Amino acid sequence: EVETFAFQAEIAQLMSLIINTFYSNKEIFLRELISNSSDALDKIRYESLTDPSKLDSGKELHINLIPNKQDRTLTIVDTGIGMTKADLINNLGTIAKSGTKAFMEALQAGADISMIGQFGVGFYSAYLVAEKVTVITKHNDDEQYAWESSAGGSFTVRTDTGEPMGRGTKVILHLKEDQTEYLEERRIKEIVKKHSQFIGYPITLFVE
Amino acid sequence: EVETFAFQAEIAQLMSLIINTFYSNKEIFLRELISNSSDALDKIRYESLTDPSKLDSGKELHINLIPNKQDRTLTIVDTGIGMTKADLINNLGTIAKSGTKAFMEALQAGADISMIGQFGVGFYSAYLVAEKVTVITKHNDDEQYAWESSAGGSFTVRTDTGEPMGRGTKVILHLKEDQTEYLEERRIKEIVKKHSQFIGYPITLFVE
Ligand SMILES: COc1ccc(CO)cc1O
Ligand SMILES: COc1ccc(CO)cc1O
């Protein structure tokens, strides 16, 4: 049982734009995914200030970076707040239609793709590097779900009976054939150091 | 009926540090307050996607900048989500103790005060320019409250029976004697243009 949904027109346009614009500085995708992860870790920390049972699903607040050259995947795992099914369907908890609008008009006033996260839709930068993106998420208030899209106007949602994760979000990036540099330890380290050096949670880069 | 609370030690330390460090680039305060405003406007927009009655307290999503040379105040008004009394007491909805920690260790690794918002405590930059800060807030789920602090380790909270605001947050900056440049139309315009030019909500600068 997989449900299939249409992107809103504006999100589908943002995805096309990210896929089709010539734009070399693709590396920013990782910074955007890590920021999303950091935000979501903040949220479950905040909630726990007043209800410490929120952390019964896992006390450790962190980010893992898991490359796999065999599968051609880069996985970003957080133990953040997670998303409900509703949040997942509703553009991964974003205000994506109005974010896309403000981003498009910025690209007019001399902005570039790297500024995507200022418009609150930095998730979609995944599509600079990935041909397909799988999102596994678990929120305290809901079940574990898998979201999936290879773009082209539609995404799926299914209840995930894969590995329970306890709480958080896992972004699986099925990388384009020409973007495997993002599987290299050296290169991931460099991008993390460049763009993500003041993140307030441990970021562990796994090794193969 | 005014309640008086002690800052957590770490927040009191952050406030001292902002007050006491020699640091010329004070203008960043406005960017930080506007970002907070933008975040809070995003939140009430998000909520409204699924419950349009959230906007019964006011449909218009915007930011006003109100200088007053007579009172020596600069007011930043948003129609964002607002804060509950609990959020207000608990460091204006922030994870300020762990934010302060990460900011302090950054200031070690060659970071500067302007990077305060990356640690999620950019509110406290108000204290670059203001000797006293009053926060009026109204959340859909609570009453209107006034928060007040001139730093020195303590803040007050009272239920505000002043002008009903419907929904949002109002930051009143009682400016230091030597910081009145932030009341000048020209200067506010310049800072908004410099630092806050891709905010996705109208920002109206009032005139005297
Ligand atoms: C709310 O949590 C999240 C939401 C979206 C994303 C996407 O990168 C990651 C998260 O951790
Ligand atoms: C959540 O709303 C807010 C919280 C804190 C501040 C502080 O600048 C402004 C807001 O609008």
Query: What does the DSSP assignment read for B62-96?
Result: -EEEEEETTTTEEEEEE-S----HHHHHTGGGS-H
Distance CA A122, CA A45 (A): 22
- CB atoms < 10 A from the CB of B102, how many? 20
Interface test with A, best of B49, B59, B87, B90 (most A CBs within 10 A): B49
- CB atoms < 10 A from the CB of A5, how many? 14
Residues of B in contact with A117 (CB under 8 A): none
- CB atoms < 10 A from the CB of A194, how many? 12
Closest CA to B102 of B122, B86, B75, B83: B122
Burial of residue B78 (number of CB atoms within 10 Å: 0-12, 13-18, 19+): buried
Structure determination method: X-ray
Q: Are A145 and A85 in contact (CB under 8 A)?
A: yes
Distance CA B42, CA B201 (A): 9
The residue length of chain B stands at 208
Domains and CATH numbers, chain B: 1-208 (3.30.565.10)
Distance CA B32, CA B38 (A): 10
**Structure tokens given for A26:** 């693709």
Q: Which residues of A touch B (CB under 8 A)?
A: 42, 45-46, 49-50, 86, 90, 93-95, 98-99, 101-102, 106, 109, 111, 115, 118-120, 197-198, 200
B65 SS3 class: strand
A138 SS3 class: strand
Distance CA B130, CA A132 (A): 49
- CB atoms < 10 A from the CB of B187, how many? 15
Distance CA A101, CA B78 (A): 21
> Which residues, judged by CB distance below 6 Å to any ligand atom, belong to the binding site of ligand 2?
B 33, 36-37, 40, 78, 80-81, 83, 92-93, 123, 169, 171
Q: Are A195 and A31 in contact (CB under 8 A)?
A: yes
Distance CA A119, CA B23 (A): 30
- Which is it for strands B203-205 and B63-68: parallel, antiparallel or unpaired? parallel
Which residues does residue B205 pair with via DSSP β-bridges, in sequence order? B65
**What type of residue is B79?**
T
Query: What does the DSSP assignment read for A72-135?
Result: TEEEEEE-S----HHHHHTGGGS-HHHHHHHHHHHHHTT--GGGGGGGT-GGGGGGGTEEEEEE
Instruction: Answer positive or negative: Cα dihedral of A22, A28, A30, A36.
Output: negative
- CB atoms < 10 A from the CB of B4, how many? 9
- CB atoms < 10 A from the CB of A146, how many? 19
